[PDB]
Coordinates of C-alpha atoms in Angstrom, one line a residue:
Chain A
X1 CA -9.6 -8.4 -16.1
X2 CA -6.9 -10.8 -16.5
X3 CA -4.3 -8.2 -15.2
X4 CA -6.5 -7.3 -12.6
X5 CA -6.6 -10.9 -11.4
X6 CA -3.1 -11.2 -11.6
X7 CA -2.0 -8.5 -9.9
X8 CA -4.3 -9.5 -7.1
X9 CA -3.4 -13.1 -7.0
X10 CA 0.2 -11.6 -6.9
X11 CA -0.5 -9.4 -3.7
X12 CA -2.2 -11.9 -2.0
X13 CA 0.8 -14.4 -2.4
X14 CA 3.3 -11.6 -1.1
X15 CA 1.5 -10.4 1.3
X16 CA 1.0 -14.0 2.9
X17 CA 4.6 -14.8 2.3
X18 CA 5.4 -11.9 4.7
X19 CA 2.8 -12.7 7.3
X20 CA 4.5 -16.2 7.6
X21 CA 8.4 -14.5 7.8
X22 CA 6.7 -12.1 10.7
Chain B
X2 CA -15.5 6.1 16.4
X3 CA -12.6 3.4 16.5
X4 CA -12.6 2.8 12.7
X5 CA -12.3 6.9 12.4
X6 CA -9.2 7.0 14.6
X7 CA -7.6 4.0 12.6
X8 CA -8.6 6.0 9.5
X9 CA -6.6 8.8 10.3
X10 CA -3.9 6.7 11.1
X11 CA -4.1 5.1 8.1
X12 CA -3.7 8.3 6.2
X13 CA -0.1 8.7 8.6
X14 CA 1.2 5.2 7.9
X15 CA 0.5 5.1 4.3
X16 CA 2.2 9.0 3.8
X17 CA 5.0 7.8 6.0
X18 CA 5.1 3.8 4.4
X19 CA 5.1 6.4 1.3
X20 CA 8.3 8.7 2.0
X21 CA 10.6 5.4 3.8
X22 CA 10.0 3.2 0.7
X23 CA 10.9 5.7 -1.7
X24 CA 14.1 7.1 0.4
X25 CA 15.2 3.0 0.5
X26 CA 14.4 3.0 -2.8
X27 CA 16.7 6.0 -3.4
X28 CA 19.2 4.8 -1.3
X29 CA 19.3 1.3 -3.4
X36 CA 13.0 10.0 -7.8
X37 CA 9.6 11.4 -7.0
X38 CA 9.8 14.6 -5.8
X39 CA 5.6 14.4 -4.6
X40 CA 6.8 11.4 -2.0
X41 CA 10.0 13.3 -0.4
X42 CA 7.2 15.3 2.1
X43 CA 5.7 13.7 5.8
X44 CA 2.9 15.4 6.7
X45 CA 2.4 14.1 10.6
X46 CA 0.8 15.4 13.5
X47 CA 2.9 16.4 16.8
X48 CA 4.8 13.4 18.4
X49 CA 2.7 10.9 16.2
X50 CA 4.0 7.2 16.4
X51 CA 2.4 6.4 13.0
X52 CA 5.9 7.8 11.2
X53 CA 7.9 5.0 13.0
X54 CA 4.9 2.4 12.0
X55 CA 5.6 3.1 8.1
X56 CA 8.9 3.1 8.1
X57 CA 9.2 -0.3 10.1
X58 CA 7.2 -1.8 7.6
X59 CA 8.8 -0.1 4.6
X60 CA 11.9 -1.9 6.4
X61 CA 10.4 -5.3 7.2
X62 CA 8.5 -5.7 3.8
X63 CA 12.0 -5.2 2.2
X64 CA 13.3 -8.6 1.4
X65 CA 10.1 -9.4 -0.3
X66 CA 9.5 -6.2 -1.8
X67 CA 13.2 -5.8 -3.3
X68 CA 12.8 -9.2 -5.4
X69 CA 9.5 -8.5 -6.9
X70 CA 9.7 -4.9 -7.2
X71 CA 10.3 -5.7 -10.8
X72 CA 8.3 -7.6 -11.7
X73 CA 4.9 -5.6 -10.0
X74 CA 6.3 -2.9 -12.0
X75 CA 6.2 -4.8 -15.1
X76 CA 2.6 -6.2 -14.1
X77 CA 1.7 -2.2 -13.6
X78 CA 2.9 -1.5 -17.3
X79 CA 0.9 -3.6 -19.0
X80 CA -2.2 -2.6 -17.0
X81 CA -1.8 0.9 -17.5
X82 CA -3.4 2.6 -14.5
X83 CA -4.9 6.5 -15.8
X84 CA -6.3 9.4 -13.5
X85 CA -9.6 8.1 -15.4
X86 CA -9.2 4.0 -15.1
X87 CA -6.8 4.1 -11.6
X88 CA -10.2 3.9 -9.1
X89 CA -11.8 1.6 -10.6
X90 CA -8.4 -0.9 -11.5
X91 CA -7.4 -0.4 -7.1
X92 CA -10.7 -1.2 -6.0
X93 CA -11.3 -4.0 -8.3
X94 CA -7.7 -5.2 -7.1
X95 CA -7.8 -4.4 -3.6
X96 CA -11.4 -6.1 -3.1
X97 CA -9.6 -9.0 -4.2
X98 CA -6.6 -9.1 -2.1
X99 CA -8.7 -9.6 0.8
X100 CA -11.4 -11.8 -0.4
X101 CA -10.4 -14.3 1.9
X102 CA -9.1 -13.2 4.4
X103 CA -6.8 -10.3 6.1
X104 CA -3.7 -10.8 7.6
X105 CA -0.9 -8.1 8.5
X106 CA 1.0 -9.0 5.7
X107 CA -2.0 -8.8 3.1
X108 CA -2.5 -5.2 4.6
X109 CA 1.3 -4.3 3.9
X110 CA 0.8 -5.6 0.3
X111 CA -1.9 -3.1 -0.2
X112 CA -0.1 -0.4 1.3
X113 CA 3.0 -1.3 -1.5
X114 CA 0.2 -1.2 -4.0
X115 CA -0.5 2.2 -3.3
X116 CA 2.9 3.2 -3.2
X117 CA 3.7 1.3 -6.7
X118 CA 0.7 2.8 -8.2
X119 CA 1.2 6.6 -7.1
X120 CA 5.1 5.8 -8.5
X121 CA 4.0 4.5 -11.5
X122 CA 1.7 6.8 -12.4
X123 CA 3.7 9.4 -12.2
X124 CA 6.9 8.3 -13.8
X125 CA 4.3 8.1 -16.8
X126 CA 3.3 12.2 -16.2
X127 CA 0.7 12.1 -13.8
X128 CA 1.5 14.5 -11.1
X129 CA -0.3 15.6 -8.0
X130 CA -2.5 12.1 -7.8
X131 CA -0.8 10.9 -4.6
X132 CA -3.2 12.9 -2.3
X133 CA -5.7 10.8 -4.5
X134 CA -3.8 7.1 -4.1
X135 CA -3.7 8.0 -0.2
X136 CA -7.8 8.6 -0.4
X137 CA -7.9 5.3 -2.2
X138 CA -6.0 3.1 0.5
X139 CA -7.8 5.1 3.3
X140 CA -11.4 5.1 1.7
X141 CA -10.7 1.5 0.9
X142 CA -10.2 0.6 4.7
X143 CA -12.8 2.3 6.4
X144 CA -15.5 0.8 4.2
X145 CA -14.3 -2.9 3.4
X146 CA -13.3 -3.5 7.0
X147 CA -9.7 -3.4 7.2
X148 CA -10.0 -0.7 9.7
X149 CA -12.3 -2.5 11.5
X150 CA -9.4 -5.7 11.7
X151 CA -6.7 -3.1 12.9
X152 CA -8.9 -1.5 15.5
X153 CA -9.7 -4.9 16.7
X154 CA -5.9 -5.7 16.8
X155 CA -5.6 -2.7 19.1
X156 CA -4.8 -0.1 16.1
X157 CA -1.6 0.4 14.0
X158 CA 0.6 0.6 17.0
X159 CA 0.2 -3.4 16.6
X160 CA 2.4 -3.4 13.4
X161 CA 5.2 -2.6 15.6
X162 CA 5.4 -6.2 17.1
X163 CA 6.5 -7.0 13.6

């Protein structure tokens, strides 16, 4: 599940990154 | 009753998110995400492609390297449910935020494209139950509906 969590980790860091730009 | 509407729209935004990503994509093929299936005069089109647009700059400099992360996972028709939900109840483990709910509609657009440049055809209809499914029943829709729906994403 180390993927998993990575992928995750990933979206939740990119998706947060764009909530700050908006 | 609100969460149902929202659903719905969901299923617009994410076919629409779907189709704008892939013709910028393009325009920097999958034949399955070159269709947009909308009702009459429905404002959800416009809502995925401004956030196709406004998730760009992030999206173009990590588009390789969620690919890359997608490869060595390895998503199947039999292992792809299990690996989104696992993934998605993650993302949002603490907390939702508009951004956090683009990410996870780029997820299901990198999935659906990744699984079919490795043969799997006719599973988008199946990624869009995923992102839709996944909403209704782990709140998101709920969030959005309190936001005043998807017509909130474009204020972004």
């Amino acid at each position: 599940e180390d993927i998993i969590r990575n992928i995750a980790r990933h979206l939740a860091q990119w998706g947060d990154s764009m909530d700050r730009s908006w | 009753a609100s969460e149902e509407q929202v659903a719905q729209d969901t299923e617009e935004v994410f076919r629409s998110y779907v189709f704008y990503r892939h013709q910028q994509e393009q325009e920097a093929a999958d034949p399955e995400m070159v269709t947009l299936p909308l009702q009459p005069s429905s404002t959800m089109g416009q809502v995925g492609r401004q956030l196709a647009i406004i998730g760009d700059d992030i999206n173009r400099r990590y588009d390789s390297e969620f690919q890359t992360m997608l490869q060595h996972l390895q998503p199947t028709a039999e292992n792809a449910y299990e690996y989104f939900t696992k993934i998605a109840t993650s993302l949002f483990e603490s907390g939702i935020n508009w951004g956090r709910v683009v990410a996870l509609l780029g997820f299901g657009y990198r999935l659906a494209l990744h699984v079919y440049q490795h043969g799997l055809t006719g599973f988008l209809g199946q990624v869009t139950r995923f992102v839709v499914d996944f909403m209704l029943h782990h709140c998101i829709a709920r969030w959005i509906a309190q936001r005043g729906g998807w017509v909130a994403a474009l204020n972004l």
